[PDB]
Write a protein that binds this ligand. Structure first.
Ligand SMILES: Nc1ncnc2c1ncn2[C@@H]1O[C@H](COP(=O)(O)OP(=O)(O)OP(=O)(O)O)[C@@H](O)[C@H]1O
Ligand SMILES: Nc1ncnc2c1ncn2[C@@H]1O[C@H](COP(=O)(O)OP(=O)(O)OP(=O)(O)O)[C@@H](O)[C@H]1O
Ligand SMILES: Nc1ncnc2c1ncn2[C@@H]1O[C@H](COP(=O)(O)OP(=O)(O)OP(=O)(O)O)[C@@H](O)[C@H]1O
Ligand SMILES: Nc1ncnc2c1ncn2[C@@H]1O[C@H](COP(=O)(O)OP(=O)(O)OP(=O)(O)O)[C@@H](O)[C@H]1O
Ligand SMILES: Nc1ncnc2c1ncn2[C@@H]1O[C@H](COP(=O)(O)OP(=O)(O)OP(=O)(O)O)[C@@H](O)[C@H]1O
Lengths: 319, 326, 326, 320, 317
């Protein structure tokens, strides 16, 4: 009828490296969905979603985990920056909108081998029933004049979280049962700085960790459709056969990490950055470089990258 | 014909623990509705609702009591943040919209193949009836009104009050169903009022809110009860939830007593979020089982003080201190 | 053909206690309406309303008098805070809208299952008749105009005045029923004017508000009367309400004298909200009975000074002092 | 074909007392309209209105004169506070909206014999474009004297209109090119020479209006078609009372309005509507059951009904 | 096929007095239009307008020249205050709207169809539209300033060429000719954002209008003032005649004041005239048949002295 706690984490482990607690959290969450809606009418409607608040550094998974959860649950998903509102009902609106495309797409599948009404109500059903809403950087609309402008968005989100109704161009949808997942670094504010009303509709606090050299090494190759898995597949098209050696990855990764530490740690994005910086030349020539096989090793990588440029501060600003 | 003061309170006691004065308040209130509208035309329209202002701490019942009142009276209800307006007529608009659902759904079944049901309705009547619904027994719950009180940029708030007058005071607002009159809508306003006194609202309003009723902080002991008594209490819920995965669960008195003492415990030590703290502590305790409960079929978990005492781990506190003191 | 100066006052005396000059003012005013519109075309349109400005304390009648004047004249009425605009044409718009429900439910309950109703109507005429109603006998009450007076960010207010001129002064505004003209609407503006003088409004307006009339603070002795004289007074109402539950209630003179001396009492000690304070204290008194009156059938409660004195309790006041005093 | 400079003034003299130069200004102005539109195509469109800026005190005629001019010329008219904009195109919109009610108003008598909306509109549009009068009140306020560029902005905003542009109305496209504009203002702080040059020159005709005098009130009090006195008489008539104001009574009533205007907030001629309603107090109530009788309002009466004044409150309280 | 550089100046000379460099500039400009659009597809679209920035004092022709240029070219034309935006796409929108009328007014007399029209109108805009941005010097630089140096960034796309949606379809500012004007008494044109500063290649200056100049704008232009009053008083039956020395006087006068006070340029003639033709304009009605001989005496009278003297004193110690 549906996946299970441990069952879903597996699926998640397929695309995200590490960040366990988090995976579990959304798992037990997604699972409670099947549990309720399996209860009898009185409770089937009385029990409510156990919203999660993921705390963590930049780009280490919060979002993927969320987007994936939705994905493996074939659930209407939608992400929104909290600061985007410094019309909130739009969130639920957009969600429902997504809900159609979803239901619709999987309708022309059986209706190929219709009616408007059934669709809309069946999309609503989906929103109201299994919608995931991801509120990014909610830690930004926390507290720390012009502040009540932010501490306001919270009061503005309550009705959604807390359960209300918003009108969409497909009908009336109820936020009552939408699963919410709020994210944030919280380097300055504690989550215990949100308005109590919200602080309590965000029961599950889960933590995500900084990503390591060693970790990068993995995100670099394990994940279904990793970066290396991608370039290989991409240069392939041009006819070029490429191969990354262990030490090469180790190097690539030790490099991503290297800069993150020396400058603006942008988390795992730094891999997409270092990769494109490495796969630079080949990406161009790959075209008329048919047949060849590039053997990207530690030497290769160590060259393609060059020299880290740090210590710009000091001098210029110091006495 | 309709329930009664004491009668209604009973029904409320089913879902809210404590907060008596409050229950009564809304009870006498919902009762006066049946009393007028039982009077003769001159007065039937001359007498007006006795709106309520519930003063209290966070999540101790203010809203449930209202939401329930509405529910047990099958009345068009609607809640709105007071600060939401820092278009107010919307409140009445949304209300009417809800009365529709109520009045509609009230004739799609109780008064009676999916293509069956169309010209036997008369979509020219429903609305009218939906209006009456609103016009006659609408309950509006204005939350944290204490926030649009006083204490530049303040007149922006002391404004929402003047904006609400017309509703409370009695006016007409156009809805996509026609004209509805707030003249008889029952209004229930709520607020903590830790900074402002209710006697800080604009007099025009301060007198349209005649009934002042207080609600209490929720106690350890109180938690113990909200914990199990209420129709569909938390435990009553988890039990029902783990049931589905095949696990049979049971909470021992001492466990509840512990769970509660625990929620309370933290509330006092940090940000007292009222009863929400139970939903919080429960999800923290039911952690483990909630995962494994799936492949943990058949077994029966016996949640006792020991269990809880563990699942919750130790308390943290007074982070502050040091770092800010000399 | 219509009532008369002294004849209208009588009707007003039925619901308002005291506040005479005011009653007169709106009387002669309502009368002039019949006077013109009785004149020949040249003047029938040249002569304009003599708009009134009621200056008074809080809740002493300013609005009842207006709302009632309107009611006894079966005239489209509408009230608006002046500060509501710190779209003004909406005033006339909403007015026109009210003229519908008035005229509508006036050629349905007069000029007359719900199928023989589409007869006569002639929608394009109903409208053309409401527009007259507005244009001819509309009363617009502009509350707390003294607030949009003057005393930066002040021109925001001294602006709503310039914004109201065209209405007062006479112009046209488009309604969803057609074009209506403010030329003849009767305007009644009210305000306490504790800080600003009326002679602080913009001259343009200062002159279109010819009639100044003063209302008096409501006294203990006064309360005693608003408490029982007025058609459908408070006591008259409660009596009528407990009746329904089957309880027979009776207020002794000394009881009223007490209830009133009570309302006044607090009004003086705190935020004087005028007569609203009676609706307050009454509810605070009829507390118990209102609950139990249900299963308290047959009995008869005798509310005397003892009673009231009890049901109310003591008054709080010197909250101030201390804390902010050295 | 149309009235004349001296001919129109006559008509105006019928409702406004005094304020001559002004009447003339709008007269020559409404006349130039008939003059052009009588010329041949090249010029018929090349010559433009000679817009007026009336400078004056509060309520001494500026608007009546304008409202009336419009009226006597049966032209689409519209008045607007200049400060209302601190959507300007609305002016032309509302104007055109009026034209419609004005054309169609007279297109139901012509079509009484025994329509065609695609023409009607096309007509009101000609109406507006051809003889529209726009009255911009208190423009002296949007003059200059930060937050000031907010006002000196409305001017730049009005140019296109005054200067001649096109604005879309729900009846079609209309051209302000030929609309007649009359701007008014007290100008007690700013000189008209304070407006933006662009506008300072599209307001050629400067005409000044005078404060209203005791003597003047005496006249606004009885001469004007439908004067106040003429009105009350007409009003108490209905209740059956015959009333009569004696010369000296008028002289007194007026000396009185003036009196106060000088002593307090001079609101111009409105002060008469004020004093009249203050005097006609009593009678207005009792006139109802006072049938038959005849009240003889003389100097004594008025002197009574009015009482005494309050002329010197300040001092004290504020002075050391 | 179309007029020419020198050929257009002529036509302009007919309504504007002086301001030659200006006339030439729009001349070569309107001419370039015919030149391109005479080229072969690759270039017919590659070459773009050479936008003009006219710098000058108040009311000395900046706008007439432009409005006329447009007129004589039967082109969709539109003027806008630059500060009007302190929705910019409207300019192009309103322009299109205008071409619609210009394209109606022709297609109606031709016959003596929707699709064809809206499209046909659109080519008009896209192909020969003139947009006159006034007092752009105001949205130049000199906090709350980035609010102006913003309108520039807002105009770029138009000038620079983009597309905007009109209720008639999609139009492209790619080829619209833009003419911007401004006094520039405080800011230099070299103070606008570079992006724009390079899209306004042609800089042309207009001069202050002189006494002597006035004398001419006073009588030479088709439908000059005098020509106008004559024509107007004619209607009332009065025959009027201005004498040379009279015009010399009227003008000398206009100029006189401009110098002594708020120099509003040529408008000062519309001013002084109305001030002079005062009396006549009223009486002219029942003054039929007569003939008025407006000489220097007459003018010198009807105006009646006015030297500056206000300032100082009250403000000086
Ligand atoms: N542990 C990880 N496993 C797999 N992919 C990862 C991991 N961490 C980061 N990524 C990749 O890096 C990107 C991180 O996106 P994500 O938004 O989840 O970070 P975040 O912590 O949610 O950041 P923010 O809240 O600042 O947006 C994704 O493309 C993801 O595929
Ligand atoms: N005494 C109580 N008995 C039963 N349930 C309660 C009680 N107090 C709180 N709750 C539960 O805790 C939550 C309290 O939310 P609620 O909004 O009712 O509190 P509130 O005081 O009205 O809130 P706010 O602070 O937003 O006004 C609800 O889920 C309710 O079921
Ligand atoms: N003298 C009176 N006689 C009868 N009812 C009165 C009297 N004074 C007040 N009331 C009652 O008390 C309330 C007074 O409110 P009302 O709005 O009429 O006063 P107000 O002068 O308009 O106040 P505000 O200036 O604050 O609007 C009404 O409900 C009215 O029924
Ligand atoms: N000289 C006059 N003759 C006749 N009636 C007059 C005269 N002056 C004023 N009135 C009357 O008094 C009022 C004068 O107001 P008016 O419309 O003239 O304003 P205004 O003088 O233009 O002032 P502002 O522009 O400051 O509003 C009108 O009702 C008009 O009927
Ligand atoms: N050189 C001139 N020859 C003829 N007429 C002129 C001349 N200069 C100005 N005028 C007349 O004076 C008016 C000037 O308007 P114009 O729009 O040309 O001024 P501008 O210099 O563009 O002003 P702005 O400061 O608004 O840009 C027009 O009516 C025009 O006929």
């Amino acid at each position: 009828s549906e996946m299970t706690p441990r069952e879903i984490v597996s699926e998640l482990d397929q695309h995200i490296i590490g960040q366990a607690d988090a995976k579990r959290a959304v798992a037990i969450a997604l699972r409670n969905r099947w549990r309720r809606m399996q209860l009898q009418e009185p409770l089937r409607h009385e029990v409510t979603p156990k919203n999660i608040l993921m705390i963590g550094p930049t780009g280490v998974g919060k979002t993927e985990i969320a987007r994936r959860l939705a994905k493996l649950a074939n659930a209407p998903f939608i992400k929104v920056e909290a600061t985007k509102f410094t019309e909130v009902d739009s969130i639920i609106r957009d969600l429902t909108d997504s809900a159609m495309k979803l239901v619709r797409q999987q309708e022309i599948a059986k209706n190929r081998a219709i009616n408007p009404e059934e669709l809309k109500q069946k999309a609503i059903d989906a929103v109201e029933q299994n919608g995931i809403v991801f509120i990014d950087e909610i830690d930004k609309i926390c507290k720390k004049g012009a502040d009540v402008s932010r501490e306001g968005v919270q009061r503005d989100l309550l009705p959604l979280v807390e359960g209300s109704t918003v009108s969409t161009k497909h009908g009336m949808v109820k936020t009552d049962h939408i699963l919410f997942i709020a994210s944030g670094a919280f380097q300055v504010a504690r989550p215990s700085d949100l308005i109590p009303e919200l602080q309590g509709r965000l029961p599950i606090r889960v933590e995500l960790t900084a990503l390591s050299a060693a970790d990068f090494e993995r995100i670099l190759t394990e994940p279904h459709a990793s970066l290396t898995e991608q370039y290989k597949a991409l240069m392939a098209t041009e006819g070029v056969n490429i191969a990354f050696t262990t030490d090469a990855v180790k190097k690539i990764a030790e490099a991503a990490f290297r800069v993150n530490e020396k400058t603006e740690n942008i988390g795992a994005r730094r891999l997409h950055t270092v990769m494109e910086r490495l796969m630079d030349k080949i990406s161009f020539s790959a075209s008329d470089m048919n047949g060849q096989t590039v053997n990207i090793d530690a030497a290769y990588v160590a060259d393609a990258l060059g020299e880290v440029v740090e210590n710009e501060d000091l001098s210029r600003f110091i006495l």
